[PDB]
């Protein structure tokens, strides 16, 4: 158990690191998506030829090229999430194998969480907000690739209705990483002591920052259910691609995360 | 939202109804499993045959692994009626759109069956027939083909879930929370369902702070288990498909197949 002033310090600690670790915040993403700004306007990709123009503007075959782009951005995201994780008080003091295990199982759940920040019902920001690729264009891609992004959009539309801001997400992201129920953890108890602290901070953070939003804490935790299901569908989709596209390689970092 | 004394009333209402609806409570099951009228123990093939002949289990009436697997289905269908009766006592439930009531039960019973199955389990086996029998985990795990591996994940879930040390008054409210999930496919009117679940969540949170004041963030930890429940339900569906498509001895009377659809 923690005193109320220590939880506020912990929330601020975490928000500060989240800003330092992730260059495209939700606040910046919403300013680009909402608009009314002439300096932050994205170039919009909705079909093949605007995709061609995007290369010229924002800097094989289309569906593959886009999918390879998503892999590259995922590797960067794992790198950003890994950096954030080291700042969670207690994480680096854990057994190394557990540090690796918590990241292996947490990074995708956090990626889809933060990907929601860059999404509205009509598409997703790309290339640090300089581009915007429509949900419709992604849904039209051939083979198995058309269905790769749609479950993420479905989650994001629901998840974004909670109206979390970055200061909320910073703590929620930390709660996800310090899950004591990950397969293969050696010392569950130190992980759960940390997550109790993180959960207490999130509970206090949500009550102060959304006092009119009843039971947001519970509703947000129930969303970890939706994250797990997206990870599993996605792994199953990668398996199909690996067994049908033999030209296509995965980054070792991604390859290692999905083994077992 | 709701005043604290109303949550205590809601918690007690749900506890009373949970008692009347389910024959074998967790308190009673825990008395039997710990050793506190000893149940008949099924640990191998011959003790199973004697259990049928002596105590006469209604779900044990083809071949052993199949007969056991179908028995689990019989009891699951009985449990669905018990859960359905309980849901009708959750304040607000029967005032929901009839299709939505049907949708919420349809998608909720699997998660509630596994939740309450844990009450009848420890690391060594499972109570059956309202506590009169006890089937060992080793015996279930030892079954052939996919049947051996069908049974083990429930024990793995149950051991972790039981570590939270919930009692029936906690579980009465948690069960109600599961049923009022606003994210089931095909719901027509989500708002009243989520309004009821907000009430239930407040009642559950207060129940857990009062009943387990030393167990910090138990409320949070219990909700995190809804991840494990959904994952095991989806695993479970995938295993039935594999059995249905591979096991030819698994056909019953057409009327029974209809009951168990
Ligand atoms: O009394 C009660 O509340 C109760 C409630 C559930 C079960 C029970 N359901 N079930 C399933 O498969 C299942 C599930 Cl979870 C959810 C939805 C649908 C099904 C279905 F597919 F079956 F339809 C089991 C599997 C294995 C099992 O044994 C175990 F867990 F592996 F050790 C017990 C179960 C139960 O079984 C008692 C029993 C055990 C052994 C022989 C005969 C009866 C009791």
From Swiss-Prot, chain A:
Q: Which residues of the full protein are shown?
A: 235 to 503 of 505
Which controlled-vocabulary keywords does the entry list?
Activator, Biological rhythms, Cytoplasm, Diabetes mellitus, Disease variant, DNA-binding, Glycoprotein, Isopeptide bond, Metal-binding, Nucleus, Obesity, Phosphoprotein, Receptor, Transcription, Transcription regulation, Ubl conjugation, Zinc, Zinc-finger
List every stretch annotated Interaction with FAM120B. 3-48
- Please tell me, according to the UniProt entry, what happens when changing residue 71 to P: In colon cancer; sporadic; somatic mutation; loss of ligand-binding
Q: Which GO terms describe its cellular component?
A: chromatin; cytosol; intracellular membrane-bounded organelle; nucleoplasm; nucleus; receptor complex; RNA polymerase II transcription regulator complex
The protein's name is Peroxisome proliferator-activated receptor gamma
Q: Describe activation and inhibition of this protein.
A: PDPK1 activates its transcriptional activity independently of its kinase activity.
Q: What is known about its subunit structure?
A: Interacts with FOXO1 (acetylated form). Heterodimer with other nuclear receptors, such as RXRA. The heterodimer with the retinoic acid receptor RXRA is called adipocyte-specific transcription factor ARF6. Interacts with NCOA6 coactivator, leading to a strong increase in transcription of target genes. Interacts with coactivator PPARBP, leading to a mild increase in transcription of target genes. Interacts with NOCA7 in a ligand-inducible manner. Interacts with NCOA1 and NCOA2 LXXLL motifs. Interacts with ASXL1, ASXL2, DNTTIP2, FAM120B, MAP2K1/MEK1, NR0B2, PDPK1, PRDM16, PRMT2 and TGFB1I1.
List the molecular function annotations (GO) for this entry.
alpha-actinin binding; arachidonate binding; chromatin binding; DNA binding; DNA binding domain binding; DNA-binding transcription activator activity, RNA polymerase II-specific; DNA-binding transcription factor activity; DNA-binding transcription factor activity, RNA polymerase II-specific
Q: What induces it?
A: (Microbial infection) Expression increases when incubated with M.tuberculosis or its lipoprotein LpqH; induction is TLR2-dependent (at protein level).
Binding-site positions, rosiglitazone: 71-74, 108, 234, 258
Covalent link (Glycyl lysine isopeptide (Lys-Gly) (interchain with G-Cter in ubiquitin)) residue numbers = 20
User: Regarding domains, what does the record say?
Assistant: The 9aaTAD motif is a transactivation domain present in a large number of yeast and animal transcription factors.
Cellular location of this protein?
A: Nucleus; Cytoplasm
Curated annotation (Swiss-Prot), chain B:
- Which residues hold rosiglitazone? 73-76, 110, 236, 260
PTM entry text:
Phosphorylated in basal conditions and dephosphorylated when treated with the ligand. May be dephosphorylated by PPP5C.
- What GO biological process terms are annotated to this protein in UniProt? BMP signaling pathway; cell differentiation; cell fate commitment; cell maturation; cellular response to hypoxia; cellular response to insulin stimulus; cellular response to low-density lipoprotein particle stimulus; epithelial cell differentiation
Tissue specificity remark: Highest expression in adipose tissue. Lower in skeletal muscle, spleen, heart and liver. Also detectable in placenta, lung and ovary.
Subcellular localization(s) per the UniProt record: Nucleus; Cytoplasm
* GO molecular-function term, one example from the UniProt record: DNA-binding transcription repressor activity, RNA polymerase II-specific
Q: Where is this cross-link: Glycyl lysine isopeptide (Lys-Gly) (interchain with G-Cter in ubiquitin)?
A: 20
Q: Which residues form the NR LBD domain?
A: 6-261
Q: What domain of life does the UniProt record list for this protein's source? A: Eukaryota
What do we know about how this protein assembles, alone or with others?
Answer: Interacts with FOXO1 (acetylated form). Heterodimer with other nuclear receptors, such as RXRA. The heterodimer with the retinoic acid receptor RXRA is called adipocyte-specific transcription factor ARF6. Interacts with NCOA6 coactivator, leading to a strong increase in transcription of target genes. Interacts with coactivator PPARBP, leading to a mild increase in transcription of target genes. Interacts with NOCA7 in a ligand-inducible manner. Interacts with NCOA1 and NCOA2 LXXLL motifs. Interacts with ASXL1, ASXL2, DNTTIP2, FAM120B, MAP2K1/MEK1, NR0B2, PDPK1, PRDM16, PRMT2 and TGFB1I1.
Q: What does the function comment of this entry state? A: Nuclear receptor that binds peroxisome proliferators such as hypolipidemic drugs and fatty acids. Once activated by a ligand, the nuclear receptor binds to DNA specific PPAR response elements (PPRE) and modulates the transcription of its target genes, such as acyl-CoA oxidase. It therefore controls the peroxisomal beta-oxidation pathway of fatty acids. Key regulator of adipocyte differentiation and glucose homeostasis. ARF6 acts as a key regulator of the tissue-specific adipocyte P2 (aP2) enhancer. (Microbial infection) Upon treatment with M.tuberculosis or its lipoprotein LpqH, phosphorylation of MAPK p38 and IL-6 production are modulated, probably via this protein.
- Indicate the family of this protein: Belongs to the nuclear hormone receptor family. NR1 subfamily.
Q: Could you identify this protein by its name? A: Peroxisome proliferator-activated receptor gamma
Q: What is the organism of origin for this protein?
A: Homo sapiens
Which span of the parent protein is shown here?
235 to 502 of 505
